[PDB]
Amino acid sequence: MAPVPVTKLVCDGDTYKCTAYLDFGDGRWVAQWDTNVFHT
Amino acid sequence: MAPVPVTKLVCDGDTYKCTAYLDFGDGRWVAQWDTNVFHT
Amino acid sequence: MAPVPVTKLVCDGDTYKCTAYLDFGDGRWVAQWDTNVFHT
Numbered sequence: 563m564a565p566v567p568v569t570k571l572v573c574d575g576d577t578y579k580c581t582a583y584l585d586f587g588d589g590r591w592v593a594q595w596d597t598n599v600f601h602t
Numbered sequence: 603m604a605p606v607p608v609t610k611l612v613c614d615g616d617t618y619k620c621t622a623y624l625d626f627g628d629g630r631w632v633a634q635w636d637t638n639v640f641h642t
Numbered sequence: 643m644a645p646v647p648v649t650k651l652v653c654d655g656d657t658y659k660c661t662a663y664l665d666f667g668d669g670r671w672v673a674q675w676d677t678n679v680f681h682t
């Protein structure tokens with residue numbers, strides 16, 4: 563399948579990005595997107 | 603609750619989208635967002 | 643590490659946002675991003 567599973571998910575409030583580690587290929591591919599981060 | 607849990611999370615480096623399967627309703631609802639994808 | 647793990651992930655089709663609860667600090671920080679939501 564073209565969509566691949568996420569194995570780990572982290573987010574960073576300095577860069578305002580979330581990074582998803584992917585099960586694909588050699589293991590070094592990530593998905594990353596801009597995000598808001600805040601204290602509730 | 604209006605926010606619902608994600609049961610599975612996949613991402614696709616051809617479409618540059620991540621898709622989250624949701625526990626809601628009949629089970630066929632997803633959340634989907636644009637994302638970057640790259641090799642580290 | 644500056645990226646921190648997500649402990650829970652929910653998404654909301656009224657607000658069109660996904661919210662990731664973060665393991666950080668006092669436990670009340672989230673990441674949140676706009677998302678599409680739809681029935682497949």
Ligand SMILES: CC(=O)N[C@@H]1[C@@H](O)[C@H](O[C@@H]2O[C@H](CO)[C@@H](O[C@@H]3O[C@H](CO[C@H]4O[C@H](CO)[C@@H](O)[C@H](O)[C@@H]4O[C@@H]4O[C@H](CO)[C@@H](O[C@@H]5O[C@H](CO[C@]6(C(=O)O)C[C@H](O)[C@@H](NC(C)=O)[C@H]([C@H](O)[C@H](O)CO)O6)[C@H](O)[C@H](O)[C@H]5O)[C@H](O)[C@H]4NC(C)=O)[C@@H](O)[C@H](O[C@H]4O[C@H](CO)[C@@H](O)[C@H](O)[C@@H]4O[C@@H]4O[C@H](CO)[C@@H](O)[C@H](O)[C@H]4NC(C)=O)[C@@H]3O)[C@H](O)[C@H]2NC(C)=O)[C@@H](CO[C@@H]2O[C@@H](C)[C@@H](O)[C@@H](O)[C@@H]2O)O[C@H]1N=[N+]=[N-]
Pocket residue numbers: 573574575576577578596597598599600643644645646664666667668671674675676
């Ligand atoms: C002691 C200690 O340590 N403590 C700690 C702390 O520290 C941390 O915190 C952190 O801190 C830091 C330091 O201070 C910081 O940093 C900073 O920042 C800032 C700000 O930022 C922002 O802005 C910017 C600009 O514009 C940008 O870039 C960024 O990015 C940001 O923004 C963001 O972004 C994002 C992404 O894009 C987005 O998202 C999105 O969202 C959306 C929505 O939106 C909204 C709406 O709704 O619309 C908007 C609005 O506005 C809002 N509202 C309000 C009211 O606010 C909303 C809300 O929020 C909601 O709704 C609720 O629900 O939202 C959508 O969702 C989408 O999808 C998304 O995507 C957002 O929005 C944004 N926001 C805003 C507000 O805008 C900055 O600015 C700065 O930078 C500066 O500085 C530096 C140095 O330091 C440098 O490097 C740079 O370059 C800069 O510089 C500058 O420059 C300029 C020009 O160039 C000049 O002019 C000047 O002068 C300079 N300056 C200097 C100084 O140099 C900085 O970076 C940060 O921020 C903080 N963070 C936070 C989060 O807060 C704490 C935390 O931590 C963190 O996180 C965690 C988790 C972990 O990771 C760790 O590690 C980290 O660190 O913690 C504490 N502790 N404890 N517990």
Ligand SMILES: CC(=O)N[C@@H]1[C@@H](O)[C@H](O[C@@H]2O[C@H](CO)[C@@H](O[C@@H]3O[C@H](CO[C@H]4O[C@H](CO)[C@@H](O)[C@H](O)[C@@H]4O[C@@H]4O[C@H](CO)[C@@H](O[C@@H]5O[C@H](CO[C@]6(C(=O)O)C[C@H](O)[C@@H](NC(C)=O)[C@H]([C@H](O)[C@H](O)CO)O6)[C@H](O)[C@H](O)[C@H]5O)[C@H](O)[C@H]4NC(C)=O)[C@@H](O)[C@H](O[C@H]4O[C@H](CO)[C@@H](O)[C@H](O)[C@@H]4O[C@@H]4O[C@H](CO)[C@@H](O)[C@H](O)[C@H]4NC(C)=O)[C@@H]3O)[C@H](O)[C@H]2NC(C)=O)[C@@H](CO[C@@H]2O[C@@H](C)[C@@H](O)[C@@H](O)[C@@H]2O)O[C@H]1N=[N+]=[N-]
Pocket residue numbers: 563564565566584586587588591594595596613614615616617618636637638639640
């Ligand atoms: C052997 C084998 O097979 N191998 C394999 C491979 O293949 C793969 O890869 C893949 O491949 C494919 C094929 O080649 C490709 O495809 C292609 O692509 C291209 C590009 O794309 C891009 O661009 C476009 C346009 O513009 C768009 O649409 C897309 O989307 C993209 O873009 C992107 O997007 C995203 C989303 O929106 C974004 O995100 C974002 O991000 C942001 C940030 O950003 C940034 C910043 O920061 O600012 C930016 C910058 O720039 C950067 N920088 C650099 C330096 O780069 C940054 C960085 O990255 C960072 O920062 C780091 O940290 O970033 C934020 O975050 C936000 O939030 C987000 O959202 C992004 O950004 C973007 N990027 C850019 C760069 O821009 C395209 O173009 C193409 O298309 C074409 O072609 C086709 C056919 O083929 C067709 O269909 C189409 O239509 C087109 O066509 C064309 O048309 C035109 C007009 O219309 C004309 O003119 C021409 O002529 C034509 N042509 C033809 C040929 O026809 C295609 O599609 C892809 O790309 C690739 N991928 C990758 C990822 O790389 C690999 C991988 O795989 C994948 O993934 C995985 C995971 C899984 O899923 C699988 O299954 C898949 O496949 O693999 C390999 N193997 N192994 N190992």
Ligand SMILES: CC(=O)N[C@@H]1[C@@H](O)[C@H](O[C@@H]2O[C@H](CO)[C@@H](O[C@@H]3O[C@H](CO[C@H]4O[C@H](CO)[C@@H](O)[C@H](O)[C@@H]4O[C@@H]4O[C@H](CO)[C@@H](O[C@@H]5O[C@H](CO[C@]6(C(=O)O)C[C@H](O)[C@@H](NC(C)=O)[C@H]([C@H](O)[C@H](O)CO)O6)[C@H](O)[C@H](O)[C@H]5O)[C@H](O)[C@H]4NC(C)=O)[C@@H](O)[C@H](O[C@H]4O[C@H](CO)[C@@H](O)[C@H](O)[C@@H]4O[C@@H]4O[C@H](CO)[C@@H](O)[C@H](O)[C@H]4NC(C)=O)[C@@H]3O)[C@H](O)[C@H]2NC(C)=O)[C@@H](CO[C@@H]2O[C@@H](C)[C@@H](O)[C@@H](O)[C@@H]2O)O[C@H]1N=[N+]=[N-]
Pocket residue numbers: 603604605606624626627628631634635636653654655656657658676677678679680
């Ligand atoms: C019986 C019962 O109960 N049932 C149930 C139901 O109900 C639900 O559903 C829901 O419902 C509700 C009620 O009806 C609704 O609400 C409504 O809505 C509407 C619409 O919204 C939209 O629009 C708006 C405006 O513009 C906005 O704001 C929003 O946000 C939305 O939009 C969206 O957004 C997002 C974010 O930003 C985005 O995303 C993105 O995406 C992208 C992509 O994109 C696209 C592309 O591709 O390009 C686009 C295109 O278009 C598309 N296409 C088509 C064909 O469609 C595509 C596709 O989709 C794909 O591709 C596929 O694959 O896509 C990327 O990805 C990025 O990254 C992202 O981010 C998106 O896009 C968008 N979309 C569109 C389409 O645009 C609205 O409008 C409304 O509002 C109104 O109303 C209210 C009241 O009610 C009020 O408050 C307001 O204010 C408004 O008002 C108005 O105002 C105006 C002015 O101001 C005036 O003029 C008027 O008159 C007024 N009116 C009145 C009435 O007042 C509302 O809000 C919703 O929507 C729904 N949802 C859904 C999801 O559907 C169901 C579901 O549920 C939910 O979800 C779940 C999961 C859970 O959470 C729960 O709890 C919830 O509820 O369910 C059912 N049951 N059962 N089974």
